[PDB]
Structure formats: structure tokens, C-alpha cells
Amino acid sequence: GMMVPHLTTALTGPLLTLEKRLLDNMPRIEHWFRSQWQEYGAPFYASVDLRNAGFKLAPVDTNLFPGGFNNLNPDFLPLCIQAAMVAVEKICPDARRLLLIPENHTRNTFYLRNVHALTHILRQAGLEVRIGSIAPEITAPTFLETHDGHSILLEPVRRKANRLELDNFDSCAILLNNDLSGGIPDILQGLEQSLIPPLHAGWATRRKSNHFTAYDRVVEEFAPLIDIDPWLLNPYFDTCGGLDFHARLGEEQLAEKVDSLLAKIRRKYAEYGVKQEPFVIVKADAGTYGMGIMTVKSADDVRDLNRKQRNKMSVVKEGLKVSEVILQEGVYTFEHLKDAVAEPVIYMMDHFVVGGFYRVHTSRGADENLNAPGMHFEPLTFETPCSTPDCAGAPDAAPNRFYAYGVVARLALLAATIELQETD
Amino acid sequence: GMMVPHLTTALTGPLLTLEKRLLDNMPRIEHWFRSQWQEYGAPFYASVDLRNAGFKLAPVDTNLFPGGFNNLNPDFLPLCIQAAMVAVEKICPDARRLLLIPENHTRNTFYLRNVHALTHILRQAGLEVRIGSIAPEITAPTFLETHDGHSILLEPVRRKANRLELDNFDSCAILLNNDLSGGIPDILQGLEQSLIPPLHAGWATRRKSNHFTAYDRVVEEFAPLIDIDPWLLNPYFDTCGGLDFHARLGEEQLAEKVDSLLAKIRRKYAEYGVKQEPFVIVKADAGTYGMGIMTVKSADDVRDLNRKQRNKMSVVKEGLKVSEVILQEGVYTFEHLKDAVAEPVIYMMDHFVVGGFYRVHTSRGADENLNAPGMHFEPLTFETPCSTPDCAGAPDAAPNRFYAYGVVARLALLAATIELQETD
Ligand SMILES: [Cl-]
Ligand SMILES: [Cl-]
Ligand SMILES: [Cl-]
């Protein structure tokens, strides 16, 4: 009776091939993941955005600071609690107390609901948890309403002798729910307490293309394990160095790389009988200053950019802050909830899939199967577990689709784990 | 709408005191358990039978070979699967294949359903699992119907060069779902593969009173942690040596110990305003030959036993096989499902509570609140999780009652873990 998203494409052969390979190799796959986690560990928590194109199933974002805990299905709270307990035992085994640092947002009601939901899980895992703000406008204990009969209490972090403290509260470890993409503040540097994840100065200006290389390496091992075309799991990408988007010196360089990537995508689209237009996501990385993103369908789309596009791709008015441009094969999503495009987000704690939700696009044009939704979505909670495949059933039965989602999400998790280890 | 058991007693003060202590110490308790598991580990799986008397909440049986997996709530399968994966990672991390040895029962339909349910969990955890019989009447692959549209395949174990094998199947480890209480067969001794749990020759004739001593030691530490009378969690007990139940030489010895135990129980019943009659469970342990059990309400009940009682307490017709007699304070259960007495069974994998079920007595007399049900019960699956306390709620709200059940079950698990380590 509960309506769920369905694919609006009949071209699903590659997805079903992937599902068949996973369901014919299920114990081999799970044994392989266990070998990987013995070598690498896993983060405390994470979320991975996927897109199901019917001809491809690929991760498109990995977040080590997930902010949608309030969107999880409450029937799965016990599974989350148990996984959070495992994470505590691996990452901070002796912890009694945990300081949670949120994003600096105090006016997003949904973000505050996430904080409440996350805090609840961590308390049920047996930790004493308090919320320590690093927002400069929080100067005293501040109660913020979630507009649902509850509130959260934000307290300003105080640094004393290489430790962060709150009123009568000295934690063992510090959990970041703030991605620090603007740079690790000096107040969080050189502390005695461990940060989770353990970020160090340099984090925010790291070479972000290493994320895509790390996922390539994971897929290069996994794809032959199950005998699948690695392209079914992995978008192509390329990079170039920093460019000045207020000049045209870098124009031909960029255009040539767009053309070459589009050509690679076209070869695969021909192989698999795909009729949609190839597209490329152009990501201008300006480190602490942010990132500018645009999508293109031809090399001409990066030539002679207009004023607004130049400003977007430069990221800020300060000159030449872009240090790398990443070009990635765009992946379609053909999942729809009635007229709305939907795309899934898979949640993990330690190396276990705990659930997730769909982002159901609020916009409604012909190109919502291409456009990234950003903040323009409403969540729709998952109805099916990801850890209960039916190996003899239909390959695209719901539990088998969700098993496949959980496999690709765990590949992306492993890649992020490897990447983070290699920043030291 | 789903009917559940309710207490038929208004004398619940001690239960509510326990619940209040647990809910005022929840993070301290969970931190304490984590410290314990770091030192001791936990078994692969276990079940613990509890009785809620309103004036006491105590474990009355610990089983390291649980046989009621088919009675678990299917909505909690993902939680079981995840816990089973943790158990695999701690106890047999590199295992690809697992040989499961069942009880020698081939005609109990419910036991075969347990085997199917257990096998399903282990396969979902990513193991290749086969069922290896050590029953002498299984001499070829044998399909047994569960009378529910399914069957299980039993294959005779073959020993070759210090390993157990089946057709094209050599496992890494061996999971016992057979308690080997009749003695570890020679075919299972001196193997290269690990047994789970890791039993050694001598197991079946161990000193069974060490189980009660180990639980005493756990409660002696836990009770002061939360400031509770340890008697609220722990039945009194005593022991004597082997006795000849076909003679009366041991009669006065036994009678005196019954009298002394009853007197201790009476003191506590007076303290707490309990009006029910104290009772004692007399357990005659004959090692591999089995155990004889009777309940008594006075020292006179062990004097001048009749023929049937003498035979029961001697256990077998072979002479003087009883090596120890354990006397335990009997604990009432006042939970009822309408007219039927009910008592809970809590399931764990690794150190995590995964669910459980009530044993709903099929018999209907005035003394079913005292009598152990044995096989005379129908299962009723738990509706409430054990890991989701509401610390500010009513102490006997359902999630808080079940949190308390999961705490006492984990104390009994820890005790069994310590006991088993100390057999080596
Ligand atoms: Cl720690
Ligand atoms: Cl930084
Ligand atoms: Cl192993």
C-alpha cells in the first residue's frame, strides 16, 4: 500500500546483469568485504548517494558527516543503535562521554531534527552526549526548537589546556557532524581528544580528485571478483589544474578534456544501446572557498561562459582560488515517485548498512533525471532492508535491488576509508 | 491490538526499584558492559530464560546452543543478521564456510524449523553453510520436511585426517547447535577446525555449580554499580556431593541443606512482603547420564522419597552416577497471557540482544507460576525491543521492562563466558 519509486525506463539489462552477478557471488562478496575491513577499518558513520540509470548503478557523493538521521525509518532504530555500539567499540572503545559538534546552522529546522535524531542514537548506544557549538554567535547555552514538541541545547565549546570542554563535561572524544570544508578552525587543532573522523589541518585543501582515484582502485579489484564491466559501477572522470574562469587562457584545455570524456561515454552508451545524451559534471574546487558546479553536454558549453557562469566557476570574487577542476561522467536517475524524480541515499555506521532515504526532487522539468537536486528535495524513507537478499528470487525484486544499493554504498565507503588513511 | 503477557501481581515494588536504578545509570551500565566484553569476549550465540516474580527478576537457564531461532520476530531479521556478522568477525574472522552440527533430532518439526531459521541467518551473514549430522542413523544425504513448504538437507559428517568434511565441502569452523551433554564424541576430538563454542573432552562432566558461582561473582560487581540488593537479580543456592537416592544415608544431609536454603528465602520474603511459599529446585547432576529435577517446599519433601522419585533423582538405573546435587531458590513467574503462565527467553548473538520469545505454558494448574514448563509450551514472539529504554518514562513501560530483561540476560551471558573461559 505504501507507494515507492519505480524506474521509468525499460532499458535495465545492465542493472539486472549486476544484480545477477551479486546474487551468484553473495558469500564471496561478504567474505571479500570482511577481508577489506580487517585491513582498513571503516568510518564511524557515512552516507552515500547513488543513481540508478538502469544501464548503470553508481555512487555520486560520499559524506563522512551525514546530516539526515531524522529521515531514517524509525522501525530500524534498533539496527542503528547496534551498529553505533559497534562503531563505539572500534573507534572509541573506552569512551563514556562524547562531544558532538554540529554544522554552524541554527535556523534550519530539518538540520536541528537531524541533530536530535543523531544524539538519540548515540545516547541509546550508551554514551553521555552533549552538543558543543563552534558557531561564533553561540555565546551561552541556547535552546533551539525543532518545531515538533522538542528542542536541542547548544553550548559554546570552551578550550582549556588542549581539551574542549562544556559545563561540568569533559569528553573522551569529539564527533564531528560539521564537515569543516571551510578549513579546520585553530580551536580544533592540537587537541588531546580524538576527532571523529580524525581530520588534520590541510583537510580542506586536500586534492579532492583522490576520492575518484580511490574508488577506481576499489572497483578495479571488485569488478573482476564478480566478473562485471567496471563501467556499470563507476563514472569516468578526468582532471585539470587551476584555471582562471575570468579569462579564456584555459578554455581550449578544458574544452578538449570535455570532448574526450564525452567521447568515452558515447562509446559505452553505444555498447549498451543507451539513447540519452551524455553529460559531464564540471567541478571547480576552490578549497576552503568552496566549489562551483555546472553540467555540460558539449565542449562548446564551456566556451565563452557568461558573467554568472564565470562567477560560479571562479567560486569567489577573490582571484585564482580554484586549484583543480574535476570532470565527471554524469549518471542519470530514472527512479520516479509518480511525477517526481527520486534518488537514494544509503546510511552506514561502522561498515554496516543501517537504512537510508530517497531524495524526491521538488522541481519538475524534463531534465530532473540529470540535474542534481541540492537542497530541493523532500525525503522519503526506505521501506526495504539492504541486508536481506533473496539469491534465488527475481534479480530486481525489492530486497535484491536494495542489496545491490548496499553493496555499491559499501564500495564507496571502502574507497573513502582508503582515501582518508592516505591523507594520514 | 496484539495481546501480550501481563503480571497478575500488584507486588512489583522491587521490580520497579530495579528498573529505576537501571534507568538512572544507563550510560554507566553500557560502559561497564563494554569494559567486560573487552576482557572476556562473548559466545557466538546464547539464550537466557528469565522469571519476573515482581519481587525479583532472575535468570533461570543459560543455553549456549539455542534451539528456538524459528520463534524470533521476522521483523528483526536484519538486527540478527548484523549481530551474526559481528560474531563471525570476532570468532571466525576469515571463515568462508561453516559446518553446522544439529541436535540428533530428526522427528521434531519445530527443531527442524529452528535449523532452517538458523541456517538462513548464517547464510545472510555471508557464510556458505551446510548441515553435518553426527546422528548414527543418518548414513546418506537425507532431506527432512519442515511441513511448511520447506526442507533441510542433513548430510553425515565424514572425518578425514583431523578434519570433518561433507561432499565437496571443507569448512573453516564448526558451529555446534548440539549441546553434547551426553559427552563429546570421539569423532569431534583432536580436530584441526575450531568448534564453536570451543568445547573440550571433560565438558559434559564439568562441575555444573560453577555456573551459579560465576553468576554470583558478576552480580557482586554489578549490584553495587547501580546500588541494588543483589538478591533482586540472583537466586540463592547451595550444593552437596553425590548421593545414593536408593538409600537414605544422604537424607539428613540433603534435608538440612533444604531447610537452611528455605530459611534464607523466608528472610527475603519477609523483607519484601512476599506471601507466596518459598520453593527449592533440587537438581541431581549425573554428568553424561543426565540430570534429575524436583521442586520442594519443605525438608520433609526430600525424606522417604517414593520409587518414581528415587528413580528420577538417581537419573539412570546404573548406580551412583550422581556427582553433585545443586539446590536453588525457585523463582516465580507471574506473567500471564490470559489464563496461561508465560516466561521470557532472551536471544543474543555476540554480546548483542537480538530478540526472543515467551514460553506460554500449555498446562493450566494453580502451580504453573512455579512449575518449569519443559517442552510443554507454545512460543509467543516478543513485540518490544530490549535496546530502546526511555529513561525519563514510566519505569515499567514496555521498552523499560524489556531493557531490564536485556540487562539481566547480558549479566547471565557474561557469567557463562567467564565460566567457559575457566574450563580453559
Ligand atoms: Cl577510547
Ligand atoms: Cl584544513
Ligand atoms: Cl577465522
Ligand SMILES: [Cl-]
Ligand atoms: Cl565430554
